[model samples]
Target: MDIEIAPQRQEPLPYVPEGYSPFQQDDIEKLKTFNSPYKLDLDKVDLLPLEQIEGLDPEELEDLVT
Candidate 1:
């Protein structure tokens, strides 16, 4: 998703959540860690952080060429 940024946009700085760092490592490790406190299995919610979100799961990817 490409978000638009206007020259005069006045939105405040975003409040990034604690214990999460975009500048740190890509999020696959964070996603694959089982028994995470944040996961709500009852609701079937599976949330991967931003970097891992797009790369989360693609069965077709196994056929891709490097």
Candidate 2:
């Protein structure tokens, strides 16, 4: 006897959730740990002592720092 049977149905794709932002989740956690709590701005730069700007000459020094 010859058996005639239909092929199996294909499996459907998995459902993805909404509002998924594609990124490296492990890198995001590592980045979070390395972040600074302090303010890094021009005002902060102005607060630095003259020794930090020692490379500049006397004329250039007149433009900024003590």
Candidate 3:
């Protein structure tokens, strides 16, 4: 005689505690070692001077000059 069998149930996953970072130790180490080829310092950047209109009214010129 075959006996009736109950279906197996899976237990819920353990709850993650607070202050848990998604980044693993290896990821953090890689980020720390990695360096960008492009410059990131804004102070050392060479920016072009602002362009001014060739013809401006006296009032407009005075406002811009000041």
Candidate 4:
């Protein structure tokens, strides 16, 4: 008789705040939707902070805030 051992599956990157047990499942689920917004093609990559997502030169100072 031959025995087959199943490989354990790997988990995704840690996506929630480090805290006590069960404290962040809700936030985790919410952020999971943000894993790849561009791939989902839903619309509005606008959820992200503009500063981090866009480059603003001195000429585009207004763009930095708006």
Candidate 5:
């Protein structure tokens, strides 16, 4: 089934932290170079540093929920 792209296409270039590690830079470069038709090129995409929907802190989440 097709899904909404607004969430993924909201921002072309979002700001990433100086030293974010969960998503490594090397992985992205590798994907860009390989361009495998199998897996996605996660490196060329922005999965976080999102305008909204970032995971909230547990203690602060209550206010946001209710």
Candidate 6:
């Protein structure tokens, strides 16, 4: 005869802070469409800070240029 033991089901903890209300479906959908003004496009790239640029290899620098 084979013996089997079932695992106990763990309950989720109520970690959320008090007075916090869940967002509505409409609000969630609206947030999905939001775009940042500072977002960069694929063709455009931002220059790295002077300190970061010093550590970049020649190959990495070439790839970033294009």
Q: Best TM-score goes to which candidate?
A: 3
The list of candidate 2 runs beyond 4 A from truth reads 1-11, 25-31, 43-66
For 1-66, candidate 4 gives per-residue lDDT tens digits of: 999899788998977676646748887888767565456553666565556537777779977687
| lDDT agreement of model 1 with the native | 0.71
| Candidate 1 displacement at residue 7 in angstroms | 14
Runs in model 3 lying further than 4 Å from the true structure: 24-33, 36-40, 43-66
- Per-residue lDDT of candidate 6, residues 1-66 (tens digit): 999999898888878888899999999999889788899989999888666537999999999999
| C-alpha lDDT score of every prediction, in listed order | 0.71, 0.77, 0.86, 0.71, 0.72, 0.89
Clashes of each: 0, 0, 0, 0, 1, 0
- State the displacement of the C-alpha of residue 11, model 3, in Å, after optimal TM-score superposition: 3.5
lDDT for model 3, please: 0.86
At residue 59, candidate 3 shows an lDDT of: 96
> Order of candidates by lDDT, top first?
6, 3, 2, 5, 4, 1
Instruction: Tell me which of candidates 1 and 2 scores higher on lDDT.
Output: 2
Candidate 1: give the clashing pairs: none
Q: Which one wins by lDDT: 2 or 4?
A: 2
lDDT of candidate 6 at residue 5, scale 0 to 100: 92
For model 6, what is the error of residue 6's alpha carbon versus the real structure, in angstroms, after optimal superposition? 7.8
Worst 10 residues of 4 by lDDT: 34-43
lDDT per residue as tens, model 3, 14-59: 7778968688999889988957788588759897899889699889
Q: Per-candidate TM vs. native?
A: 0.19, 0.26, 0.29, 0.18, 0.19, 0.28
